[PDB]
Write a protein that binds this ligand. Sequence first.
Ligand SMILES: C=CC[S@](=O)C[C@H](N)C(=O)O
Lengths: 383, 380
Amino acid sequence: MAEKQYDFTHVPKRQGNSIKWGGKEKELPMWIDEMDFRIAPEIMTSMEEKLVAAFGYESVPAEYYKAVADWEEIEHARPKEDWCVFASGVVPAISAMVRQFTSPGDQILVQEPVYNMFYSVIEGNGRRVISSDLIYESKYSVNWADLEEKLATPSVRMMVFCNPHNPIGYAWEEEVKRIAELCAKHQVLLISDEIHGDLVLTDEDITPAFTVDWDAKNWVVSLISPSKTFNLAALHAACAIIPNPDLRARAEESFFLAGIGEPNLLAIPAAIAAYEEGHNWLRELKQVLRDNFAYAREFLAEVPEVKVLDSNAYLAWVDISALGMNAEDFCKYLREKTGLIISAGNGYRGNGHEFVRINLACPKELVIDGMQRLKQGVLNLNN
Amino acid sequence: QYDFTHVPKRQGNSIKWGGLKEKELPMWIDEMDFRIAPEIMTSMEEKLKVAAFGYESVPAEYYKAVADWEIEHARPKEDWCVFASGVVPAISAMVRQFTSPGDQILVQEPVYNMFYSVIEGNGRRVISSDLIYESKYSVNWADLEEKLATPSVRMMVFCNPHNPIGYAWSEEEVKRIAELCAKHQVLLISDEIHGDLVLTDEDITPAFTVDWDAKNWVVSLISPSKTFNLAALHAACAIIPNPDLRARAEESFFLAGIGEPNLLAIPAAIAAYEEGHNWLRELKQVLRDNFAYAREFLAVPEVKVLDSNAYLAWVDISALGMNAEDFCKYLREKTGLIISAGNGYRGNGHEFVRINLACPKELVIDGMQRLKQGVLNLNN
Ligand SMILES: C=CC[S@](=O)C[C@H](N)C(=O)O
């Protein structure tokens, strides 16, 4: 092969409070959205240098927005640094922007099936989910007429738009300006969560919503973070990109009010290192991930009873309807007999009750064992 | 056994130290100029070597560390305990969950200015039963009960030990307040983030210790952040005896996005609560020393360091007849010493300065001379 500068073979050893690896003998979790790779050693170096030995209150330096705008220029479209505001997390920032830009009672449009934490922060904040469901016929599709009639609804004040879309792994262009343009037209804030934007495995690119014509650029917020990209979920560093100057200043005051406007001790130095010294680690990763998807899509093509969707952005969305069993029970039964743990599609709503989600961001050895645990689980049902 | 003489060299984005002029001495904002406990430090660099930082739950050891630590004071039941990334944000979330917009929320002015940000910024209304200032503050118990009895007063933010006065309330006072709140079905939020830093052996009585008339109406908030110089760790704990109250506050932490620990919060905090007793014992001796050196030097008799039993020195400048802000502004100007104006704390704060003493005695030396220097140029 072409020798990889960095280690994509060795599974980090987590402490016992890890959600993914914490709490049975010979069990294999591929459900929760975090990698099983060591982070880039260039980020590790930045973290270690910061650990000054006194960790008092921290401000957000102009060097953070500069690394952010640079990464987005080099890897995708350069935002203005003035557009940027730090927040400690994507979902935290959404939740605060729900509380800031909508009222209790207001509806918030999503596209089911979608990341299950969207429902929690909309419903838990006393707003109401409305969905222009995604049409499934081995691809999903947008019922645009149904999308427009929901946006025009007076009580529909926000669209939370997954770009690219978890869990179907779909990277939306042109579709994104339409969506922006329809939001603007009906005066609906478009919140573009782009947390998976860097992990497009095809060289299709994501279209950040902040790049839309000024006709609609005043109705958009893009959210990025290094977190899913460099395996730093617990770093609590994200970035809202908000061109409308009043919008942005109001987002920022609510981040403060919520307690998610100030960086923790490593959020600044590690994020800057990722955004400025992480291109080469990512490019290599993307080769390991492409290789894992190929291996998995190919092996499942041994299990004809399931149908993987055509992804274009590391999670595999797998159609298990043929087994004629509910994904919650399948995932339960599959676990108890094989020790493989994958995430049932129920929680993602839409047609999720027919699907399962398998996280392939792990060394190939675990992709093999995983896929084959899955084949075992299927074989036992037919016997 | 531990270093309290050399000031950590911060990166450029420190609030306290970032972007200061030459020859400027920051003694205003509440973080220390000491390196942290090596045992804490250790746990941080071990966690880092994991080299992958995905989602972390809160382990029961975190609540056991917290209960064991509370040796220092009172043992909360481990089930009562709920992680949140910080004290003020959990105050912010409990305001939104437990009151309605327009409701009133009672402080005892003068108090820590962040209490007004979270009360007013959430569209709630501040009402104060001012503490009666007579070189010390006292409580008007008649006034406090009338206000708590007002139907639109739904909550009370109680600072215990009370910042900026530096006063750790009596077991008597603490339970009397909890009885009145419960009498009048007002929720009592006990900010106890300074409880580990009472300089006298006069220990804090955490609101969670009050008995079952009123234990159902209390919430205690603690945190290693002030004690161990960890404001950027984002690790804290709410102690909430009432379980239906506890379950609700927990879902409000999760929606605010403060209910989940960062990559360091859990192991550093467990390190602090399990092994930081000796480090802290030695910190407190450094602080009684600098408090001692501070009051004797100022006794500047036109100012009055009033009796603090817990490291921010609340200094009365009423005899110089100068507004705190205009004073602290003029001080920074000619002398370079930066100190917190009392105005932001409301009450009678505009006649007081707050002075941070958690720095090596040499910086305390330099600051006190600077302050005296200032007081003399006003008279020339
Ligand atoms: C604790 C359960 C919710 S979990 O942390 C959300 C995560 N991105 C996932 O992939 O499920």
